[PDB]
Every structure is written in structure tokens, then in C-alpha cells.
Design a protein around this ligand. Structure first.
Ligand SMILES: *[C@@H]1O[C@H](CO)[C@@H](O)[C@H](O)[C@H]1NC(C)=O
Length: 356
């Protein structure tokens, strides 16, 4: 229970139900590294599915029941045994209570049953942390898992711009996007968007942006233009538009990707080819991503799991790869790689994959 809750002092920046958003913080004095982690947990995109999420996933829509502390795990752990990478950093966990993939900029009002303020929550957390020691930082790593990983891609350059505009151009802003790199690929079985479960992420996100007043990074917005901003939620399309260094962690056979592809796991030829092609497409999208870790496993998220150190690609663990990334940001480094993508073509062809 080492990270302590702070509700935002600006109480106009709210969770979905208008309760104040917030963050959990464990300071490390004398460290100039700050890790801000964005929680995940899917999204909702219309009144009916947001109402259902409010009934049974209320902690993802409200701060009213949040505990006063949370325990840091994985990359948020302060113990070097669990976190070889950044155990001495200042740790921040930002709960996901906006259901908008961290993209929204709309308040609850006479027009809006819910507030979708994800993009403003991140900005407000950064602003309030500056007065709690972030002003002295050398590196701010914005990390996140699942929808929080996509949220890194959507917001890392805006955090960089915010700090520059606030007069902190020496803080190096970097991103770590875990399990947020999705493909707008053909589904294995096909359903028109006629309700929540049948609606593919491209259609659900196009609807969500309008419902949330969702915002995307400026260079990506300028490429795709009005009505096409949903493209910016897909990592392989938004990443090339970003300026901040971003390390991409993505299982090749991500369970959430398979879910949105209508795959539910003896596998016959059509599905075998489908799965193999998914891994091949994911690997292709990462070919020119220099800092990446993409194991051939059927799983979902990694960085805040306590056993995150166990998986390796080509003999290198993720904490090692992240350390090599830090060194690279001081020509490639002898024995300390940063681009680690499996080439074997089937889930758990890597023996270090999580056991489940
Ligand atoms: C509070 O947050 C809102 C929404 O982002 C912003 O417009 C406003 O300037 C903030 N107010 C203060 C006092 O920081």
C-alpha cells in the first residue's frame, strides 16, 4: 500500500460521474525519474453501454469508492527484486475513470450524462505533480496498459508540449505503451455494428470520439482529418506521427485483439491461418519500431504484473530491454538490445510465455 491517493485539486476535472479524478503517488526523494502509469480497462461509447459499465465496473467511472492507497506492482514496484528497471523512481498510478481511452475532453452537463475527461485528467495530474517535485525531473515516462497503452500513444506528445509551454523544456518525456497496439484487421467472424458486442473497434471508436469529444495528437489529426480521427487510436498509424521516444510492448497474440477479432479459443486450418497471419501482421507493424518488445504469446498486459521480469525475447527480459532503451537515450549497444520481436509463428512458441 505504498502509493497514496490524491484527488485532483481542480475538481472540474472529473471521472465519468462527475466525482473528482486523481492519482496515487509514491515519491522517491532525490530521484529525478517519474513514472506516470495509465490504467486500462476497455471503454464505453454510448449511453446504454456506459450505463451498464456504471453498474458493474464503477471504479472505472467514479472515484467515490477508491481506496486511499494502492500497492505498486511490476514496473510500479519500489523493490529492485520485483522491478530491476526503475525501482527508485517516483511512482504515479493514474486510475482510468473516464472510459474514453484517455482521449476525452468533455464535461458532464445538461447535454452530457457522463464526463469524458481522460486527456484533461492527464494534463491536470502533470500540472499538480509539478508542485510536488516533478519540476525537478529529468525524465517523465508516461506508461500504460491496454486502453492506457493506447492512451500513452494519444497523449505523450501533448505532455511534452504542456511541459514545454509551462517552461520545463529540460524534462525528457517518453512513452511506454503496453498492450495498446491494436490492428484494424479483418475479424475471423464478421458482425455489423448493431449493438455493443457486434461493434468492431473501428466503429466503436468512431462513435466514441463523437460521444467523448475525443482528441488525438495534432500531426495524426492533420493527416487523417475530420471524421477520420479514429485512425489515430491504432498504434501503427499514430506512432509514426509522434516525436517523443516510445517503447512499444505488445504480445503478438494479444487476448484483447483476438476478442475484437471474434476469436474464442483443436484448431482447424482456417483459424490456424488466421492466428498465424495476425502474428505476422503484428510483427510487420513493428519492423521499423526501434524500441519494442513483442513476444509470441497469447496473453494481455505485462508491465504492472509482479512476474513481469520472467518473459524474455531472444534471451532478453523486458526490464533489461527498458534499461537498454534508457542507455540508448543517453549506434546500438553490445548485448543490450532494444528491438525484440519474436519470429516464431504460434502462441507459446516462446517457452518463457506466461503460464496463465
Ligand atoms: C481546471 O481544469 C479545467 C479543465 O481542464 C481548466 O480549463 C481550468 O483552467 C482548470 N482550472 C484551474 C484553476 O487550474
Amino acid at each position: 500500500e505504498d502509493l497514496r491517493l490524491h484527488l485532483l485539486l481542480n475538481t472540474s476535472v472529473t471521472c465519468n460521474d462527475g466525482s473528482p479524478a486523481g492519482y496515487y503517488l509514491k515519491e522517491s526523494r532525490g530521484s529525478r525519474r517519474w513514472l506516470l502509469f495509465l490504467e486500462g480497462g476497455w471503454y464505453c461509447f454510448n449511453r446504454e453501454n456506459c450505463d451498464s459499465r456504471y453498474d458493474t465496473m464503477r471504479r472505472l467511472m467514479s472515484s467515490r469508492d477508491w481506496p486511499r492507497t494502492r500497492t505498486g506492482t511490476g514496473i510500479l514496484s519500489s523493490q529492485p527484486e520485483e522491478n530491476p528497471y526503475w525501482w527508485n523512481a517516483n511512482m504515479v498510478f493514474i486510475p482510468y475513470c473516464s472510459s474514453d481511452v484517455w482521449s476525452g475532453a468533455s464535461s458532464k452537463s445538461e447535454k452530457n450524462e457522463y464526463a469524458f475527461m481522460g486527456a484533461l485528467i492527464i494534463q491536470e495530474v502533470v500540472r499538480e505533480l509539478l508542485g510536488r517535485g516533478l519540476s525537478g525531473a529529468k525524465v517523465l515516462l508516461l506508461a500504460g496498459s491496454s486502453a492506457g497503452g493506447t492512451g500513452v500513444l494519444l497523449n505523450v506528445d501533448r505532455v511534452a508540449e504542456q511541459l514545454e509551454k509551462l517552461g520545463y523544456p529540460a524534462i525528457q518525456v517518453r512513452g511506454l505503451a503496453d498492450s495498446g497496439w491494436f490492428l484494424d484487421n479483418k475479424q475471423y467472424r464478421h458482425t455489423d455494428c448493431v449493438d455493443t458486442i457486434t461493434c468492431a473497434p473501428t466503429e466503436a471508436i468512431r462513435r466514441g470520439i463523437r460521444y467523448w469529444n475525443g482528441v488525438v495528437p495534432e500531426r495524426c489529426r492533420r493527416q487523417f482529418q475530420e471524421g477520420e480521427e479514429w485512425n489515430c487510436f491504432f498504434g501503427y498509424k499514430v506512432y509514426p506521427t509522434l516525436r517523443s521516444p516510445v517503447f512499444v510492448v505488445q504480445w503478438l497474440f494479444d487476448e484483447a485483439q483476438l476478442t475484437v477479432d471474434n476469436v474464442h479459443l483443436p484448431v482447424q486450418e482456417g483459424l490456424r491461418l488466421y492466428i498465424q497471419n495476425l502474428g505476422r501482421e503484428l510483427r510487420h507493424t513493428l519492423k521499423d519500431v526501434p524500441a519494442s518488445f513483442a513476444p509470441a504469446c497469447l496473453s494481455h498486459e505485462i508491465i504492472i504484473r509482479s512476474h513481469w521480469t520472467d518473459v524474455q525475447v531472444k534471451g532478453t527480459s523486458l526490464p533489461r530491454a527498458l534499461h537498454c532503451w534508457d542507455r540508448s537515450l543517453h549506434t546500438p549497444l553490445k548485448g543490450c538490445p532494444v528491438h525484440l520481436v519474436d519470429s516464431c509463428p504460434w502462441p507459446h512458441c516462446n517457452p518463457s510465455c506466461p503460464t496463465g
